[PDB]
Design a binder for this molecule. Structure first.
Ligand SMILES: Nc1ncnc2c1ncn2[C@@H]1O[C@H](CSCC[C@H](N)C(=O)O)[C@@H](O)[C@H]1O
Ligand SMILES: Nc1ncnc2c1ncn2[C@@H]1O[C@H](CSCC[C@H](N)C(=O)O)[C@@H](O)[C@H]1O
Ligand SMILES: [Mg+2]
Ligand SMILES: [Mg+2]
Lengths: 234, 242
């Protein structure tokens, strides 16, 4: 974590974010999500964690659209994955993909105690080959309702070209961190780790592309670090 | 407020935003909102920006989020409480299918008639039943006449800010199980973040205290699941559980 941006907020004060979390998020957070978050807070990459207010937003979307089959790309310790698994019905199904299974094992005991591991097919791999392989075998009747994209930041455009064919018409594709700590707002942004700058430029290009992509409708939402919701049109 | 009482000259929060910079908000609007905004929404927004109550207008990024929720949940029958010039109402009517139906309520029809030419030009006024009235008597009459068959899929609440809690007690019975109730402005320019806050007009302070109480109440209400979203001035989404 030699990164520069980890502690930057997109909201105007730490006090405002704290108010949201303490008033509206933590009281509604499943005990196993609380447990998973607290153990993840001890980890070196805790800054990658999907925050608790964003989690409840993901859950609300899944329930409002009556999602049943989803894909979760970029799992880390499993906060967004457990959010999804708790939101789905008892017979819901999730394909979860991450290059690093050791991160998943940090949160897996909490997923198991929540009683939802049976919904999850965890695949340890880089996401792009898995999505390529899904496209070759995907039957139209098995298209996903919802995809959450939170893996290699520099690769979101490549994920998008597969996902617009893997989610159903009317299904949702959510891209996490599309404001990149607010640093996308300017053509140049000093002081970044070179990997952070790669990600920043990738998101500026992605945001412009998705706003013109005729295959989806979009809504960029200033929650967490920015989330762009895409809905497949055809 | 826009509906009744104090003028805009007294208000203290109008120039605040919940995001960390105006540059970030401008980036969101110019990159992701304006390119996806219907030309009649653009026209309605631009005429409304010149009105004395422009601070109450639902912004363009929030509008596209409302549209996205409506479409993802396949909403068909909705209620819009607090219309003003009609930005969120036109957003809803464009999002709904051709046979969608909206019950729109506002105490001031003259505000609505500012936006009506754009709604007409957009070709979706046929979906809208506009009712000029305070909202509570209308909702109470709906409670007496409603059958389970005709419950609303979605309600957008953006009327008298001091009175959302009373709206909520009706809407949890008027929206179907699994349907959505959205409360607008629940972060009130960030001023909800402290028990005490300096220098607001009495009406702004009454609204601030109302939102602090509402946010605590909704988080404790077993009838709904919630998500408070830091878009616009804060939107709290509620989903009816029973
Ligand atoms: N090419 C790749 N394919 C799949 N996963 C990748 C990847 N590159 C990085 N990742 C994974 O992407 C994750 C980003 S952090 C994901 C956070 C998680 N969604 C949450 O709810 O908190 C890390 O776990 C990392 O191991
Ligand atoms: N008691 C009441 N019943 C119904 N409408 C009310 C009301 N008190 C105030 N209002 C109306 O609530 C509106 C708040 S501003 C609404 C903004 C609008 N939703 C948008 O998309 O921009 C004003 O038009 C005001 O006239
Ligand atoms: Mg992320
Ligand atoms: Mg409002």
């Amino acid at each position: 974590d030699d990164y520069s941006l980890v502690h930057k907020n997109i909201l105007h004060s730490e006090d405002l974010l704290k108010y949201i979390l303490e008033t509206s998020a933590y009281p509604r957070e499943h005990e196993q999500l609380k447990g998973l978050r607290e153990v993840t807070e001890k980890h070196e990459w805790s800054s990658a964690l999907v925050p608790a207010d964003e989690g409840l937003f993901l859950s609300m979307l899944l329930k409002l659209m009556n999602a049943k089959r989803t894909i979760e790309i970029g799992v880390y310790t499993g906060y967004s994955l457990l959010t999804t698994a708790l939101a789905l019905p008892e017979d819901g199904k999730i394909t979860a993909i991450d290059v690093n299974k050791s991160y998943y094992e940090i949160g897996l005991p909490f997923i198991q105690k929540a009683g939802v591991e049976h919904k999850i097919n965890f695949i340890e791999s880089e996401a792009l080959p898995v999505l390529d392989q899904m496209l070759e075998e995907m039957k139209e009747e098995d298209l996903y309702d919802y995809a959450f994209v939170d893996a290699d930041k520099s690769n979101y455009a490549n994920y998008h070209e597969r996902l617009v064919k893997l989610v159903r018409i009317g299904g949702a594709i959510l891209y996490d961190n599309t404001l990149w700590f607010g640093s996308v707002a300017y053509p140049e942004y000093p002081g970044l780790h070179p990997e952070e700058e790669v990600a920043r430029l990738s998101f500026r290009n992605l945001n412009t592309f998705l706003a013109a992509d005729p295959r989806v409708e979009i809504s960029q939402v200033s929650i967490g670090d920015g989330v762009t919701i895409c809905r497949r049109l055809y």
